Design an enzyme around this catalytic site. Sequence first.
Site, short mmCIF file in Angstrom:
data_model
loop_
_atom_site.label_atom_id
_atom_site.label_comp_id
_atom_site.label_asym_id
_atom_site.label_seq_id
_atom_site.Cartn_x
_atom_site.Cartn_y
_atom_site.Cartn_z
N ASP A 46 -11.61 -3.81 -9.52
CA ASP A 46 -10.94 -3.97 -10.82
C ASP A 46 -11.77 -3.19 -11.83
O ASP A 46 -12.82 -2.65 -11.49
CB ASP A 46 -10.95 -5.44 -11.24
CG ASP A 46 -9.85 -6.25 -10.61
OD1 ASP A 46 -10.06 -6.81 -9.52
OD2 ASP A 46 -8.76 -6.34 -11.22
N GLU A 214 -4.67 -15.13 -16.22
CA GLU A 214 -3.37 -14.47 -16.19
C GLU A 214 -2.30 -15.52 -16.38
O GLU A 214 -2.28 -16.53 -15.68
CB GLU A 214 -3.15 -13.75 -14.86
CG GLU A 214 -4.13 -12.63 -14.66
CD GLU A 214 -4.40 -12.35 -13.19
OE1 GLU A 214 -4.19 -13.26 -12.35
OE2 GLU A 214 -4.85 -11.22 -12.88
N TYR A 324 -1.00 -11.45 -5.37
CA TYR A 324 -0.13 -11.35 -6.56
C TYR A 324 1.34 -11.07 -6.20
O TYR A 324 1.62 -10.37 -5.23
CB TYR A 324 -0.62 -10.24 -7.51
CG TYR A 324 -1.92 -10.51 -8.27
CD1 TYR A 324 -2.84 -11.48 -7.85
CD2 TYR A 324 -2.23 -9.77 -9.41
CE1 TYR A 324 -4.05 -11.70 -8.55
CE2 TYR A 324 -3.43 -9.98 -10.12
CZ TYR A 324 -4.33 -10.94 -9.68
OH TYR A 324 -5.49 -11.14 -10.39
#
EC number: 3.2.1.18
Length: 361
Positions: A46, A214, A324
């Site tokens: 990331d 998130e 995800y």
Amino acid sequence: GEPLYTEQDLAVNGREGFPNYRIPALTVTPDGDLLASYDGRPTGIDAPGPNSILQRRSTDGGRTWGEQQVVSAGQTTAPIKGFSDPSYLVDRETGTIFNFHVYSQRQGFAGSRPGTDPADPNVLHANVATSTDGGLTWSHRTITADITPDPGWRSRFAASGEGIQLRYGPHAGRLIQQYTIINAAGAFQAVSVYSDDHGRTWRAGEAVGVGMDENKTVELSDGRVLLNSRDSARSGYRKVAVSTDGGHSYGPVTIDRDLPDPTNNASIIRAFPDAPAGSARAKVLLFSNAASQTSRSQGTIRMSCDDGQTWPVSKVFQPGSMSYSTLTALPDGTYGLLYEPGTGIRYANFNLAWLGGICAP
């Protein structure tokens, strides 16, 4: 009807130029084209990894996909730059498409320093790419300054997936994209970033909760905005809150025991986005996530017929690895699902009959 469930990989690690792909975002253009966006990660990491935002397009309802194109190109040689975690947002009124994502240099989310200067390499910047030609070409903007009303907010990033546009009430037309920020004390909070002028200016609402991450929002049948968040405090469940306004503020955050989650991203959408306020159809929600509380696996889709109060129907779409996932309503009445099976990114298409419920006739 006849249940439908099909899937195909859109990106597999090591193929097409990148050793690793992650973080899905999916949407449908006003023309009806399907757009899939995700990270190309040269170092499998990331931010501050020198990542790129990629996109693939389908012009035949998702059966076939065009070539991988670059939305935002990261820079692997110093000065290193990276672009990660995409979220699409379509203004159905004007036809404009937005792709939100991180702009990193030296720091990632945890290491970002306070500050708003685009030239400062120590802050994790918030960028938005705007397209008025159905996702073909893009204009870019760093909007960190616009969405940091509190100088104490030292970091932020848009939750990857897809944002929304309100259809009801006094704020109909409003574009909403969720972010996670780190305040002065070091707490992770959620905040809605929105625009009332079709994307010309973006501003932040009031931050909510602690132990947030998130998070996604949906407009309920009565116009209230439901916030559904990953819990960075790892309760084993999703956290939820509701907003009754515009100039966004949310009520208290509570854990939803109906939604087990291993601290991972998820998606929540209106099954019938165009249904009139208060109708039965307007109360139907679809939610996708990893249902296991111990690992990112057992991807399942749940359906609520009462604005998220209960989720009587559920079906596993991926028994194994599943990180995800994002959902979008397709023009033919079916649903698109972009998810991470561990090998890159995969697109699935299913209809309501597939979800089942009753073993009719």
